[model samples]
Target chain A: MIPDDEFIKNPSVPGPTAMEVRCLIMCLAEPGKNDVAVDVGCGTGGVTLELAGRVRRVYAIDRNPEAISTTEMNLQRHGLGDNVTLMEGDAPEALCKIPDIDIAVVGGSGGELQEILRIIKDKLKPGGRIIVTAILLETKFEAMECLRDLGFDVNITELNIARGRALDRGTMMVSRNPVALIYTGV
Target chain B: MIPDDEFIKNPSVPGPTAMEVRCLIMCLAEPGKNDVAVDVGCGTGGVTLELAGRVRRVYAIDRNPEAISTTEMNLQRHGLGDNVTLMEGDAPEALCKIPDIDIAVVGGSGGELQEILRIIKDKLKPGGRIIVTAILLETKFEAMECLRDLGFDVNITELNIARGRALDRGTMMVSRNPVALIYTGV
Candidate 1:
């Protein structure tokens, strides 16, 4: 488990995503050594790097060119490029080139969440998993409606996390932006 | 991976706690084959049952005798009573007899949620984890306060789940009671 500080970051991009949340996604995905996964809207490549070490292969896609470069650089720094495929393009469209995946972690849906999920639903392998983290309540509801419509059991978790920073005398738990982690195995 | 309907449940008790939530807790706790855990509320014994199969030992305590009995019956039916110790009494007080735990799962606090968390905080092992599922917003606040005051990082998740049920012609995703799974390791 690389500490949060270890990941290389691009200030222009959104993030490496919180390591705590990333960890939760991995745990729930139940990553298999032979599984193939994808990171849709892979910002900073943090998730791509994490999945690269655990699964047989991973594909990351993003419409933002900066996001792609950031992910690529981070993956290179971690020396896990061998198992990852990076694509710089929009999802649902970009995801077209990806192979069938055992797991999909969605960080940024880019308003094509419905279409993105539909594609995953169509191609997911038996016992396949999908985990998406949303910051907006609207996105949460949309994901739920879309996932349930696809006949998947939807389980959502609002990750309200606070990091403990060392204070003058003790500790202060600083709040991080809340992210809603929505997941299910269809 | 037991289905929700598999357990012999108590009609009067609060619940078996949803399996999805229980699975998430187990995943986050990073359950070990040689770990000691405790179920503070032990509502339906569902959590206790799940923990018994994963960890080395488990202690389930409940102030309500019915809950204790319900847990015992469920464990007995599962044929996993060997690794479990059931206590029919209040938490924090009943917790006095528990061994130092590697994990603690709280399902019901009986209004002593803060004290219960405090007790677990004091005796946890180096990598011990505390996972409490709160049904009320106020409880979430109390837990966050107590865990932070005790120097543990709190990560909370509000589980909004809808299980698919078979209908005459189609499937309906029925909502479950929303539970806030608050976890951290001090």
Candidate 2:
């Protein structure tokens, strides 16, 4: 297991997703040994490397050039470059180039979440799962609507996580961004 | 790192809180060797047992007789009974008898949330933290308001967690009740 701190992060890019939140999403995605997965908006390769660790292959996509390079660097750092194909392009459009996928984790939708979900619905293999993480309530509402309209079995969970920081005599709980995890599958 | 399955559970009572959610709360509470913590609404002792594992002493309280007994049973099952004091009584009213505490985790407020928060504010040590888990939006709002009124440094995170079930070729994600973790500290 790669410790969260092990992931190399680039300040110029959006992320390296939070380790705890990434783990929760991965747990919900439930990638298998023989299955293939795609990480939509694979920021800094945090989720990409995690997906690669669990599945046979991972396609990491991002529109941000720095994010793509950051992911590539982290993948190489972990000796996991071979398991992930890093791509720089817009999602859904970029998603079309990848083969049928067993699991798709969408971290960023770039105001094209509905279109991305429509494409994922068409391309996801039978029994495949789509896991999307949204920090904004509007995006969550839109994603939920898109998934429901597509007739996929859907589940949504919002994660509010805070790690503790030790104080002089006690501990302080530090909050992270609350995330909504939207899951859809056959 | 006790496997979540290790906890003894009584389904007839309130619950064995979800394992991942339990872990997230523990991470935020950040108990220590000198700290004493309280679990208000210690249903099934899920959070109680978890809190005991990290703090020097724990007081697990529940208004329901069955919940108190179940907490006792689970505490003994985990051989953690020695560190936890089990009490059966309604909160805030019941909260008074417990000693000044360094941390308080309010898992339930019995619609008397404002009163409970007021009491906790009086009893919590200067640098102590209050962490409340609310399932209902009304309760979350009230708790946030009460904490703000008390002038504590506050942070809130909502947790939406879904665990996956293995399917024939992929996986299915199952959603659990989303919980709001509200934190307040001096």
Candidate 3:
């Protein structure tokens, strides 16, 4: 819900999801208006805000207090403090306290992708959606395998995006780190 | 601007650009407020419509009359007739009548990816953007080579998207073709 200009940030966080990656996750998940969502590793709260805008409520969990603090600032700035519950702890463990979820977005795994996948498989409501965004190929592949093993239909996209900067003579394109978005429908 | 439900369609057309692919192209190209764009092989005008919405004007060219007609119908239905000029003829040849462009999207190369790249190099304005979506690895490689030979910076993405279909007990994921989107900034 944070306006483009009003979105707050803290660069010290270990992982802050990219702008395009956030958009792609939203497009793939298509969170429903009344759906209850969860954001694991909600770095800087970018995806958390996006989910809160579309869904009824979002539970944002992150072990990094700095990230949780940044997200909290952004949520208050956007007047969406009431729409998201900030949980300052690691996922899977953090997710236990939350209610059944219709949508879950994972931006970082902290090397527990398989564990998180198992938890999500057990907790996701029937027909719920789970989206995982990863910069490393090994994580992506492992996530895909875990999702398939859990009996969730999985889809994957390898995204490479470039931003164009205009100069006096022409435009120069700068490439971003490539990431994969793995989606599971349970 | 066609409403999602009212977009016209004809399966006989060569290839209708997918909704997600259209969005990815727009994200990469970042069409300026005063830009003019060209769509070569604009089958069914999905990408053309998207471009028209973002730019000042767009020229949608196709070698097949059926494709052009379908695009025209969709354009009129969407009330975007004034924003786009529909051209029915082969690309590289048909592209001649277009003025220098700020953005160009090539959905199909008609077995002439290199030739199209050369024409775009000559016709694209400085700082202009060009995007090509290819399904085959061969076409992607050739396009990359051609863009590099022309001294333009290029970026590539291989997209594999799957949409989820809800079932009685769970969800089913349907995978779409994996396509590559290549970008060149002039």
Candidate 4:
């Protein structure tokens, strides 16, 4: 999906949206503390920041250098830089460096969603939970179904936002965007 | 409640003690039929006989006189009797002649249980399940409690029998009483 050139001029991909991070935290933060968490395709540390109060450590990794750098900046802002390790590379390859994960989140950067999900399943500890977010329902459904086929008890939920914009008579109207999450126990 | 010696000698009740009725029906009857049942103080018929069918018709009423006449005339030998009707004085007045029911088992012989239950709530419909044995836990509790005091959801199940010996000194257990079918509604 693409927006007009003007919208892309700044091309600012806002850091982890509130809903996405909340989804990540909710999927991970069960009753117990000190669980291991991994934030795959971590963009600007949206979810990683939220994980600080819950898990013992969060491994925030992304293939994009700029995103990784931004993640470090965000982690420092939250005074969690020491607790978060920002790695660079594809999630599947980058995940090899991390040990067991009790909680996992895969924030979509688009493409190869299936492969990234498969790696998250392999890396998560027994009874761990994984949260996946995507901009498109079709993509989310594919991921959820794939997780289901892997014998994980899964749940799927969606979030919709309508941004209010100046209208014909200086009125505010919302532009629609659909977002979804697919989660499952390890 | 004590039974007259003649009533003890009589036979119309079937097998299946009241506890067996409670256990078998509550534990094993199909869920769909749970809506209603009836027990005619059904003498030897026992709650089991009534429970044998789907719960749609748990009718149990006994005008022992009618049963005696039926038996003497040999009018019907079929396990299922003629149209199930309360063989008591009349409708409403004979509430105790039937079972207390709700969400099922509409009209029946209550003997007096009908008015007692009706004071608390409206009547049940047809196809309600009813049993007559001795009043149990909740009934006794209600009897002890003051006016308008709430009672627990009581399922009264009783086991009453008389054991005798046969000519060869063999033991013969004889079931000789109607049990009260006390149940919490659907």
TM-score of chain A of 4: 0.78
lDDT (tens digit, per residue) of candidate 2 on B1-186: 343456666666766777666765665666787899999998978888877767888998888888988888877876787888888878867889988998888987688888888888888886888999888878877887688788877666666666545466644557778777788754
Docking quality category of candidate 3 according to DockQ thresholds: incorrect
**Model 3: residues with Cα > 4 Å off, grouped in runs:** A1-14, A18-20, A25-41, A44-63, A69-186, B1-6
User: Which is the winner by DockQ between candidate 3 and candidate 4?
Assistant: 3
lDDT of 1 by residue, A30-61 (tens): 78789999889888887888898888999989
Give the per-residue lDDT of model 4 (tens digit) for B1-186.
011221222354333243323332333222245454444344444332334343444444444554334322221333444434434333344444444443222222334544444533444443332222334444433432311233333243233323222335532445445333344423
DockQ (Cα-based) for each candidate = 0.10, 0.14, 0.11, 0.01
TM-score values for chain B across all models: 0.96, 0.92, 0.93, 0.26
Cα lDDT tens digits for candidate 3, B1-186: 232335677878855665566666766787776899999988877888777767888999888898999988887766776888888877878887789999988887689889998998899998899899998868977887788799898767666655444467654556678777878755
> Please, what are the lDDT tens digits per residue for candidate 4 over residues A75-101?
665566666777878777888888888
Clash pairs for candidate 2:
A157-B160, A158-B159, A158-B160, A159-B159, A159-B160, A160-B158, A160-B159
Cα error, candidate 1, residue B24 (Å): 6.1
Tens digits of lDDT, candidate 3, A11-77: 7765446566776677667667899989988887888887878899999988889989988887777
List where candidate 1 sits over 4 angstroms from the true fold: A1-11, A16-30, A72-82, A89-97, A111-122, A132-185, B1-9, B17-28, B72-83, B90-94, B111-122, B131-185
TM-score for the first chain in candidate 2 comes to 0.93
Badly placed stretches (over 4 Å) of model 4 are: A1-14, A20-32, A162-176, B1-186
Weakest lDDT window of 10 consecutive positions for candidate 4 chain B: B1-10
Per-residue lDDT, model 1, residue B107, is 77
